[PDB]
């Protein structure tokens, strides 16, 4: 189970980034890069992420139904509480953060269009 796995990868894993004594996750699927069981979605039976996808917000999801078939264990879906509505569809507790990342993904996307355009 995940209770056991997390207690295995907790002291070390590819994803733990214990730098300067600070501990952030390199995990693709973590939302706030906080090395926590709530978030370590690579580990969780179910998981949700709200990364950008070329201007578009992307909301990768991982219902457990796929089980252990990594090639297809994760299911993307491109797309502001609506994204949170999708993420809660799989992980209800992740949603409050999944909304707030999903926003900050938007301000980043707006901020960089301002920056990428200003780089001209």
């Amino acid at each position: 189970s995940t209770d056991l796995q997390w207690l295995l990868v907790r002291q070390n894993s590819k994803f733990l980034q214990k730098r300067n004594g600070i501990r952030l996750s390199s995990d693709p699927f973590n939302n706030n890069a906080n090395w926590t069981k709530r978030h370590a979605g690579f580990l969780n039976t179910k998981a949700a992420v709200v990364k950008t996808k070329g201007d578009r917000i992307l909301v990768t999801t991982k219902d457990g139904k796929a089980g252990n078939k990594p090639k297809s264990m994760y299911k993307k879906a491109v797309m502001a509480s609506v994204v949170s509505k999708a993420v809660a569809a799989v992980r209800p507790d992740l949603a409050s953060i999944a909304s707030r990342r999903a926003r900050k993904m938007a301000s980043t996307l707006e901020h960089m269009k301002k920056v990428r355009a200003a780089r001209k």
């Binding site: 796995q5 295995l8 070390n12 252990n68 078939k69 090639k71 264990m73």
Partner: protein, 325 residues
């Protein structure tokens, strides 16, 4: 159960049940304890010469000569004459505790813990989170455990095999290795360790006849089911390696390690250790309805502050009214 993806292509060639070994307990501490001690057996004696630093004639000049009483090399006509000698502190002198050829270089591990460990590190490779956790790029992998068609060992040419690795999606973790290769940091490089590179997928052949094309194909370690090595199953002593089981190597993986309920046919009376927990996710229990039912469901100075005193002594205002006059 587990589908057996063909080497030739994406399509599965059929399904096989998980051998009970993958259901076996994952105990990282034993994989670590066994790995730690097991890695010492590869290990090789070093020692200083029996009589280094001590190969001189030396005597202390005694006291009464305005010099420390360390032994001094005698004679004359040389730079080393009168030079201190033998003590660990001196040049050319002896090391503190000279190294011996009879250090305990190697270790005993109980045959059972060595087995508890190979079990736990295979069971740890059945779990994609642990296996991608340790470093492997498993994102293209069709499934974990990745069992694969038996004729994958029929390959002769190396690029027959390279075609196979892309098919099963393993090549992204083999690219992980070819790219991970560089000159070792530190001294180890002038000690025949000049190149370090990351562990990649461990193909596991049914028997010795499979290897040829998969030799040389760098970043692809080969393994034999009939001699699985915990030094390879848990590199670094961390469980979770990526293993490409061959279908033949996989189906006989309970013939080797046995069930929780049935002895190994090769390892004597060995039998998979019973989980300490029948229900290994404690958090699901705590949140269970059977368990939820039983759960248990400004002023400082009180004498001079007016509101504080009126609170401690409700009658105080009825008393202060008495004070007027």
């Amino acid at each position: 159960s587990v589908s057996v993806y063909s080497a030739s292509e994406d399509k599965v060639v059929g399904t096989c049940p998980l051998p009970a070994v993958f259901t076996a307990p994952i105990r990282h501490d034993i994989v670590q304890f066994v790995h730690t001690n097991m890695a010492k057996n590869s290990r090789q004696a070093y020692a200083v010469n029996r009589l280094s630093g001590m190969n001189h004639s030396a005597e202390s000049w005694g006291t009464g000569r305005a010099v420390a009483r360390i032994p001094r090399i005698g004679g004359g006509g040389t730079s080393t004459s009168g030079a201190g000698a033998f003590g660990n502190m001196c040049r050319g002198g002896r090391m503190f505790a000279p190294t011996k050829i009879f250090r305990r270089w190697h270790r005993k591990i109980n045959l059972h813990q060595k087995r508890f460990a190979v079990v736990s590190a295979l069971a740890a490779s059945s779990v994609p989170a642990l296996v991608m956790s340790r470093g492997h790029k498993i994102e293209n992998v069709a499934e974990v455990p990745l069992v694969v068609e038996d004729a994958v060992q029929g390959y002769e040419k190396t690029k027959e095999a390279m075609a196979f690795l892309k098919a099963i999606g393993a090549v992204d973790d083999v690219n992980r290795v070819n790219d991970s290769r560089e000159i070792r940091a530190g001294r180890g490089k002038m000690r025949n360790r000049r190149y370090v590179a990351r562990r990649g997928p461990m193909l596991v052949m049914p028997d010795n006849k499979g290897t040829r094309a998969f030799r040389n194909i760098f970043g692809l370690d080969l393994a034999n089911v009939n001699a699985l090595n915990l030094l390879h199953l848990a590199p670094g002593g961390h469980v979770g390696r990526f293993v490409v089981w061959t279908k033949g190597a996989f189906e006989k993986l309970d013939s080797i390690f046995g069930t929780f309920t049935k002895a190994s046919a090769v390892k004597k009376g060995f039998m998979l250790p019973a989980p300490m927990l029948t229900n290994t996710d404690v958090t699901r229990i705590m949140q269970s309805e059977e368990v939820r039912r039983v759960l248990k469901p400004q002023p400082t100075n009180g004498f001079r502050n007016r509101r504080l005193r009126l609170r401690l002594n409700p009658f105080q205002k009825k008393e202060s009214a008495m004070v007027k006059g």
